[PDB]
Structures are given as structure tokens and as C-alpha cells.
């Protein structure tokens, strides 16, 4: 049964068996999480470009980096962007199952610079739950903001 924890730390330092990158469609180092991933796993950006709403895995040895491209809500209506966010997480879940990994480190997609200025914690995390519940991986959610740590912690608590 999939389990969920949250940690307040740089996802580049995760101890899990694979990592999900909050990637962009052009496959660029980007900023934020994406750049942290680039700094730790540069060779994961070989041919990593992939369209909004999809995920593409690039292996670093046997360590998978799952580039998940959520929408930039500055460029999508709320309905269309919510569909692509859901779809990006669903593609991450499918890749986690395919890879057969026991655990996955995962950031909240379409937040920060992709959020259009809006607080999208609950929206993005609920899509994360819905996708990852179809796996049996242990899920570790990474964030940097103390308050977001608290909010994710509570949301986890009140599904069990």
C-alpha cells in the first residue's frame, strides 16, 4: 500500500530510489527544483524535453529521474491547466510502476513560478495522491516552505 511522508529539504538530497523533476517542456535547467535537479543529475537532461502533461524518464545508471511537465498556469485556463496537471502526475505514477522502484521523491507540480500567482498546494497535492494511490511505492513529498510542510503533513494525516 502506498505510504506518504513529507520532508522540508532540497529534493536533490532525497534518499529515495527515484526522483520526479518539476521539469519544463523545453528540457532546460530552469530554476527552483528543476535547477536543483540539474545541478545534482545533469546527465538526466539528455533529451529530456517533453510536452506539458507528460513525463519522461532519463536513467542515471539505475537511478531514474522522472521529468514531469506540469502546466504553467499563466498560459492555461484553470480548467485546461487542471487537466494537464492531473495528467502529468498520472504519467509519473505509470513510470514509477514501470520502473519497479520501491520509493519516489516528488515535488508539488505547477506551484511557484508555474502557479500564476495562486496558492495551488491543495490542488496539486490532491492530484498527486490520486495518481500515486495507483502505485505501491512509498512516496516522499519534498517542499521548502515551513508552512507548506505543515499543510501537507495534515493532508496526509487525514486520509488514513
From Swiss-Prot:
Domain Macro intervals: 1-160
Record-listed ADP-D-ribose binding positions: 10, 24, 32, 112-114
PTM info: Phosphorylated by host on serines and threonines.
Subcellular location: Host cytoplasmic vesicle membrane
Effect of residue 33 to A: Partial loss of mono-ADP-ribosylhydrolase activity
Function (record text): Seems to be essential for minus-strand RNAs and subgenomic 26S mRNAs synthesis. Displays mono-ADP-ribosylhydrolase activity. ADP-ribosylation is a post-translational modification that controls various processes of the host cell and the virus probably needs to revert it for optimal viral replication. Binds proteins of G3BP family and sequesters them into the viral RNA replication complexes thereby inhibiting the formation of host stress granules on viral mRNAs.
Subunit structure: Interacts with mRNA-capping enzyme nsP1. Interacts (via C-terminus) with host G3BP1; this interaction inhibits the formation of host stress granules on viral mRNAs and the nsp3-G3BP1 complexes bind viral RNAs and probably orchestrate the assembly of viral replication complexes. Interacts (via C-terminus) with host G3BP2; this interaction inhibits the formation of host stress granules on viral mRNAs and the nsp3-G3BP2 complexes bind viral RNAs and probably orchestrate the assembly of viral replication complexes. Interacts (via C-terminus) with host NAP1L1.
The name this protein goes by in its record: Non-structural protein 3
Organism annotation: Chikungunya virus (strain S27-African prototype) (CHIKV)
Stretch of the intact protein here: 1334 to 1493 of 2474
